[PDB]
Amino acid sequence: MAMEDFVRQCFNPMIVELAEKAMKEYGEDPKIETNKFAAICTHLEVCFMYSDFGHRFEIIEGRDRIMAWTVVNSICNTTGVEKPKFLPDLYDYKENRFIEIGVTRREVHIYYLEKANKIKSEKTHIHIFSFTGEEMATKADYTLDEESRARIKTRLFTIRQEMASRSLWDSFRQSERGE
Numbered sequence: 001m002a003m004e005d006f007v008r009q010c011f012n013p014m015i016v017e018l019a020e021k022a023m024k025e026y027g028e029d030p031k032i033e034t035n036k037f038a039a040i041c042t043h044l045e046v047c048f049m050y051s052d053f054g055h056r057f058e059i060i061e062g063r064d065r066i067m068a069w070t071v072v073n074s075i076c077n078t079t080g081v082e083k084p085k086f087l088p089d090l091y092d093y094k095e096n097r098f099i100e101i102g103v104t105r106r107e108v109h110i111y112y113l114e115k116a117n118k119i120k121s122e123k124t125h126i127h128i129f130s131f132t133g134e135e136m137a138t139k140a141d142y143t144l145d146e147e148s149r150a151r152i153k154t155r156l157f158t159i160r161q162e163m164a165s166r167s168l169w170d171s172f173r174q175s176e177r178g179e
């Protein structure tokens, strides 16, 4: 599969490893669910890129569940912030709110709704990105400066166009696996 190769060649090895690990613990084969793999890596990379653009952010995504919950519980005890039911992706120490990051092949408002409805009754901030350079964020608060946002969007668009070079983008966009 080109898709498997694309992933190994366009994401850094820690991201790939982390994606593979997660898949293989829940019985998923990256060589089979290649769209899922690409999506997991893609979303991981966005999470990492988002935290890098500020110790503004605590990274929750990309850790095992024990460590993720340890971090969340720790943030809650020391801030007062209510505990989410789902593991979010980051915590913002400046705005003092968790963030859920969405990356979607569909329209951003569509995915935004899905997410807001999945974690309704949470006060988690939501930030959605597409592969078209659209974003949607709770209360149009986008958290990052334009440069950081622009860097994420360029990376996403670039993934898309790489997939398209390799005739993989049509499969990927018509799949929702990983969202």
Ligand SMILES: Cc1cc(=O)c(O)c(C(=O)O)[nH]1
Binding pocket: 043, 061, 087, 088, 089, 101, 102, 103, 178, 179
């Ligand atoms: C399907 C999905 C989408 C996300 O954006 C996400 O953060 C998670 C997560 O498991 O943390 N899962």
Ligand SMILES: [Mn+2]
Binding pocket: 061, 087, 088, 089
């Ligand atoms: Mn997550």
Ligand SMILES: [Mn+2]
Binding pocket: 043, 089, 100, 101, 102, 103
């Ligand atoms: Mn997410």
